[PDB]
Ligand binder design. Sequence first.
Ligand SMILES: [Co+2]
Ligand SMILES: [Co+2]
Ligand SMILES: [Co+2]
Lengths: 206, 206, 206
Amino acid sequence: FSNIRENPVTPWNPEPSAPVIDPTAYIDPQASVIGEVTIGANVMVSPMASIRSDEGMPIFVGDRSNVQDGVVLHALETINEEGEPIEDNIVEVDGKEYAVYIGNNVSLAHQSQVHGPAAVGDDTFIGMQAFVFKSKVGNNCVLEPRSAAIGVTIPDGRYIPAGMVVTSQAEADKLPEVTDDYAYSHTNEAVVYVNVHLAEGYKETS
Amino acid sequence: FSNIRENPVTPWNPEPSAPVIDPTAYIDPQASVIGEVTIGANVMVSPMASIRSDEGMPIFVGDRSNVQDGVVLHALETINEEGEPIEDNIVEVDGKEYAVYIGNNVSLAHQSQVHGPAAVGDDTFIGMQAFVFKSKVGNNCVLEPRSAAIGVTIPDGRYIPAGMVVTSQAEADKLPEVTDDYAYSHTNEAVVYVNVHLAEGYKETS
Amino acid sequence: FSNIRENPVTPWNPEPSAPVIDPTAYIDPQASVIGEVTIGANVMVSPMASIRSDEGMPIFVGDRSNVQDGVVLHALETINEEGEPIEDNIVEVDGKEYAVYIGNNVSLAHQSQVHGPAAVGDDTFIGMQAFVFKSKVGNNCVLEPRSAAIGVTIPDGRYIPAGMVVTSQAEADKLPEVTDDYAYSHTNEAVVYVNVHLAEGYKETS
Ligand SMILES: [Co+2]
Ligand SMILES: [Co+2]
Ligand SMILES: [Co+2]
């Protein structure tokens, strides 16, 4: 069996698609990547990650991002019964439509999940075991371990404290800002540096 | 190696069992299904799911249910030292004994977990990253993402708000009810429709 | 592809290492174990677990411990740019340095995660979906399902109630103690008994 595969034919998917993966990205043998997915350069996809673009599609992962162990990417149906695009389940980023958009230099840490409709802006850290669903996470954000964003827009440069589940726009509007002395202020840039080097080291083993 | 396997011989398992899977169910190649397990018709088991019936057994998954990416099903020992059935770890459903019972038309969303002793009634949605242990979840329920039910009985037609950890029967007795205007009121039926179609599309690829 | 593998060459890893695994330990075929890792005797590593010692290293797992389905072990870089050991990311246990130290008779239950720098003392249960990061968990502890310890030291014989996220030393200092009547007081010893027997039963299938 192959771990990089096309999505299945369904009522909302007449013409199956295979993943478009940059030659510089590293896909672990025990990761799964199915369907209408774009993976950018220098991306690392670790063991036990599941990127499944078979319901809502497409799922994009930008350059120099990382999808760590056990992370799941999936999305709600983007096409309805009559083939009507379900606009509530589609996210717009730079004039293009996605089910799930992961930007560039984004870290999806171990066991996190980003479920469409969703977008995660550049240089954001999504902490261990964190959750993003029906939300837009701006750039330069930090979701601490076990935090969650559901049904909201997290403004650029804010963080979500560990364990906090943000479900209302009033709460996301009052999230704290990332500053230099904040404990996770330098975490994402270190993580992206490490992970781009791991992708290249792992590529040299395949 | 095979991903559908018998459970190992142990002091509580003299005669090993292999999974009984309906020919219409789809088991991803990167899912694991071990031991005394019954999988019903039109069920989809996604990448990185682990259904392990080697301690507490049996584990049943009803017709038209779905076990999404990274979901785990496991259970506490159902047989003690002298071979005594441990009744506190066995759940009764329709006059039959289970370690874990997942009913029909049940969705176990990505990264959730249902650990025996446990039962989940028909047409219930168990949200992303949610947890069920030593509990009985009624039919037509909704566990929002990151909710949990531990040591309790959740009455039919109730929901558990995102992030809430329900550990006492007094709290489960006061959970809110699913109504038509509730945000997840139509989620499970849509999910089951999608997932029965995905199982058939994936079956046509194997 | 092999599921037990060496870590890749990187700027902080000139000389790659392969896992040192006791012949009595059982590594599921769908688990992943990479790099500078020591696995002790009678350890069971279940499906979908990921033990990755490629950034922070080494990762040790003591005798008669268990790494359940979907558990992740990983760690922050232990070597800086100039090759300087990053002491804040290294944990000391019995005069030896680790990125992640899991002691003996420790249970890492399904979907939990222990991220370095971290140490978990002997005879501790780390519950389902629980999280340990930049912390030291003493011996004879219990982390209930969905609890978390981040940036703290949990004293010997304490437990963390389900769902509680402990982020300050003042809070960890006031955690409750394990007593005989506590609900999870006998859980770890039962789990370790079961899991040492499962490792041996599974070893007899390979
Ligand atoms: Co989904
Ligand atoms: Co278990
Ligand atoms: Co890590």
